[PDB]
């Protein structure tokens, strides 16, 4: 089999569509997601044209091996898609309608700057390489782009699945290449981060601040060092669910800042004890009373500054 010949000099237009059946395994560390979808293809092959009046048949069904099919690939996949052809239909004018169901693991970079209050645009890039006989170009049939109502991505809200209708046509290894960008817009369900990480992390921090109502150095050291260790555990827990980024994330910034608050609380607890031992408790009392206001106030203002810089 060979490509359909051009009537004049025009490129062969392959109309495409992706209909999402399943979305699963959005892996933040790997920056991948798995997809199960319909891939629809349509192009004109005049060699396959027939008369509907004398044939009595409106459509002809072909097997993939019987006819020429464009070699359509995904750019951002781990391995080649696992595909099963569903149907091939030919209209009397020779317009071919191809439908396959496929599954693939897609590589799509994620922006973690606003994590866990982040939104993402996942991409599925469709591509075709031109043949020596003729140039193949891709198009979007909007009537064949969509998603099943039941499509759920655990921990995410699916906003939209659209295609950038204009392909990116470019030369690659002395041939033309036609690339389409299918975009799946999602927003993270931040809900569970509040009772599981944010509030427990705030509770232990506020517990360290009870040391500002205590003159017992031994108890103070226990309060601030124990809660610091619990903060380290939350830091480790959070960084296991995330890849290493060449930038600060919102959560990373707060987690890092809270260390400074633990460090300054240890200085305060040390300074307080040192002065009491030096028979200067009136002074220690002034620093401790100031700390009761300063620590929550600086914590609030630093969080307003951070929220402003990130959102």
């Amino acid at each position: 089999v060979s490509p359909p010949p051009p009537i004049a000099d025009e490129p062969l237009t392959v109309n495409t569509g992706i209909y999402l059946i399943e979305c699963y395994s959005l892996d933040d560390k790997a920056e991948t997601f798995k997809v199960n979808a319909f891939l629809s293809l349509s192009w004109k092959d005049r060699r396959l044209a027939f008369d509907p009046v004398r044939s009595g048949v409106r459509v002809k069904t072909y097997e993939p091996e019987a006819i020429w099919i464009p070699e359509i690939r995904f750019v951002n996949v781990e391995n080649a898609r696992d595909a099963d052809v569903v149907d091939i239909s030919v209209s009397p004018d020779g317009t071919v309608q191809y439908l396959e169901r496929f599954s693939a693991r897609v590589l799509s970079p994620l922006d973690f700057r606003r994590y866990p209050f982040d939104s993402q645009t996942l991409h599925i890039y469709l591509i075709v390489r031109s043949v020596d006989t003729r140039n193949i170009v891709l198009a979007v049939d909007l009537e064949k782009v969509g998603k099943n109502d039941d499509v759920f991505l655990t921990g995410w809200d699916i906003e939209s699945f659209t295609a950038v209708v204009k392909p990116a046509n470019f030369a690659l290894e002395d041939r033309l290449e036609s690339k389409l960008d299918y975009q799946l817009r999602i927003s993270r369900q931040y809900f569970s981060y509040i009772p599981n990480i944010i509030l427990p992390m705030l509770f232990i921090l506020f517990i360290s601040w009870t040391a500002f109502w205590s003159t017992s150095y031994e108890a103070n050291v226990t309060l601030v060092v124990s809660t610091l260790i619990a903060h380290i555990a939350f830091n480790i827990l959070v960084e296991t669910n995330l890849p290493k980024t060449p930038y600060m994330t919102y959560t990373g910034a707060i987690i890092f800042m809270i260390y400074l608050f633990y460090f300054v609380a240890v200085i305060e607890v040390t300074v307080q004890h040192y002065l009491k031992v030096e028979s200067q408790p009136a002074r220690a009392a002034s620093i401790t009373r100031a700390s009761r206001i300063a620590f929550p106030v600086v914590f609030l203002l630093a969080n307003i500054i951070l929220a402003f810089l990130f959102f």
Copy 2:
């Protein structure tokens, strides 16, 4: 090969059945389960009809490639099922009996609201897409729906395996699609959660309340902060076995509430020490004695409220 032609204008009815051989790997985080089963299919193909007297046989055995077979797929699977055809049998009137053994990884959302005292309805969605030539509709042969007695799903009780007999017929890319819902009802074996997570979590909480019978601030700080850290460990352990949900789970609610009890216990221990240092122990004694009753009473009432809201 082409689909059986209609005698009048009727859709082709494909009778289906699923017989479960094995159920394994119910993954709560992934919201998947693996299944090994028989898939049975039956439909009328008049072109295959024969006379028993002339042929000298009452049944005809074909190879899948020799005859037309409907393209039946699963909606909610990760990848296409691993299937091996067991038998194809044709009766004199062209009634085809198809049997395959398959294995598949199924995606099925789970409701964790009542975890670990939850029940689930797992779904296996069977689907067929119509051809230009004719409309294909699915039906349930109840005589061919079932499960092996030895079918066990580790950590779960299997209640029933039934099929919703009327298919969900709908249009998908200008073609009729016929979808059947096979339902596997299961209930979680909550037993092990009692000695492994619930009771250890209650013991450490009750140990933190021994601080209400102690005037030693340094010992009190050690009691409440150490048990809090152990509570954080149980919180982390529990959340590793569960996905992130946009709602509160029963366990999540109790775990979160217990933080409030640790937080208020630290306030009490702080207030008690502060008053003692200020030479007001009579008062501190009133707050501590009230706390001995208030903490277990508020804990019991808050748990009754939570159990009521969730069950």
Copy 3:
């Protein structure tokens, strides 16, 4: 190809054998094990009879596609076995000798009641479904059942590999099925559990009992709460190597009971401190001296009771 025809009315007997080459990956949580073995099959097919004089050869060698082969499957496997045909030898009367080497992941439930001093009976269920032309039945050739001397299952002792010679013949979806039960008897190597979990767990418990020779409340709180946390770590470690069971395991029972001992030790340490603060140390001394005997004695008797109930 079709099944061999009956001389009278008898079912076709397929003689079977399994020879274990490798046993590996006994996964307690998944209740699976991997196996690499020889599967031998033997049946008479008179349509394959030949004269050694005419054909020259005394035994004919065939390719699986060239002749009829019974569709033998495993019941309790995750996916269909990975098999490679080693030989298909046909003797002049038409007796077929089939040999394949296969690998499979087998689902076999485990009884954890006596863990880590437990024994198991792993099963490999062989099955064949009858066809329309004739009924197929399975048999065991004991001369072809066995295991390689070097077969080792890490963490287990292999006792025996035998087959229940009588098949379980039953009706399934209006056809006969013939099932054979191959049994691999194993016993767990409990050795490593003694220095890694049992003795460390006993040491930390005995360390908490040093609080019965101390009047220092703050040291006592540190002794009992710190060792409790280490006990929680061992509880978590043990439960990661085990599935969730709807029954108590021997280890689970001991681990759970040790929490009660930590809980009562905290009560004792609290009661002791309370009385000494109330200027009643004579009494506190009576409770502490009694505890020195009561705690090890009740611990010994409770362990004798538990060992009796479980073994």
Copy 4:
């Protein structure tokens, strides 16, 4: 099919190119990375030559099975590459242009000596074996070596992708082998190691040094032992992301050295308490005051020495 015959006695030159489409999963522990790329091959086959005039075609397309194709393999791959032929074009003189898209898991050793401020040279070794008919040699077509602009390796910066143009020709199992070295130069994005591991590790160390402004032995023991345990947690965290090396890494060196600082801080805290109990506090005060300067100064100088030895 057989290899192209030599016009004189020359070896057959196979021109190669690798164009990277995707780079992912650089696993430090496994010392592997996954790659998705184009592999281009070019060689002259006189037997496939044609005249453009009498053929009416300027180029001829073939199926891989129709013509002779060199058996090109990768040396440093886990399993054989997953490849799909994209195009095979033949020019009039019989110059074959082969293009395949492949995916492979590549084994490439990593030098962790300067971790996390390390750079690596990943290798993809292309190989061909000679045949008895003729010697097959590899060459690099620099015009067909490159990478997509969007190629990103999470946690790394991609510097260059070049090929060593001169192949390594050598004998292997009495046949000559022609090997090409494709080099992907990368540098680690050390950014995230600063707020997640380096600064938290420095904060806990500086917190242990507050013991040099405290006379409370009980508090000092708590400060140094608690932060040491947190240092152990960071040591364990770091070693989980790295393989075991027969040399010291930069991070490993610092982590190990910080133990010495904790060990000497415990000696100081012990010596201080011992002297105070022995009624020699003036002396203990001299050691503690010296320690306030000595510990940060020796820490700075030891880090300058280490940075010098490693960079």
Copy 5:
């Protein structure tokens, strides 16, 4: 195709060779390693002999399907090897030279008795099963046994790769079997265990011994119990990298022994406090001073005894 016929009554000798290209993933827990190698085979097939002066061709290249090839398998593999035939060459006398490149996951038991200062002998067992026509025996072509210079097994030193030239010929299920033992001798790179596990474990133990220079019971309890918990963390870390063994490992023995030292240190700290409370400090002073010498001396002698028993 059928096996080559014997000239007299001799078994068919299949000469073998394994040339290692890659060695990776030595998994201690699983007792497996992955291998990528050349497998070479050689045997005489007289039915394939040809005249060298008449034919003009000195060697004939065949496709695997065109000729008879012995069914060579690996005994100790998880799944059948992934193999790709590289070349098949026939010399005038009919000597066949077969070469394939394969990858396999090999099961090979490991002796952990001297861990992490252990050496191992990994095995690759080659096997052939005889046919009814004739007996097939294996031999080693030492010229075709070897390994690439770049073969590296992360965390190990590769000493030698040799073959036991005499096969193990035995009867299995009424046919002869010919087995060859290929041995890969390796020694563990123990280097990293010294700064990561051994020295940190010794530091925390020596820190517990500072309690012998302290009269503060509350500080002593904190020193011994905190370091014990850190020892438990190292015990757990070590046992995660190792399988469960029915014997003691060298590391396991030291780790277990160090618990006894923590247990006796707690007794000493308890006895010391008890005597001081009983107004017997002169005595407590004698026990504490003796402990300062006894603990390091008994630790040294116990380690000399252990090193002697294990090495």
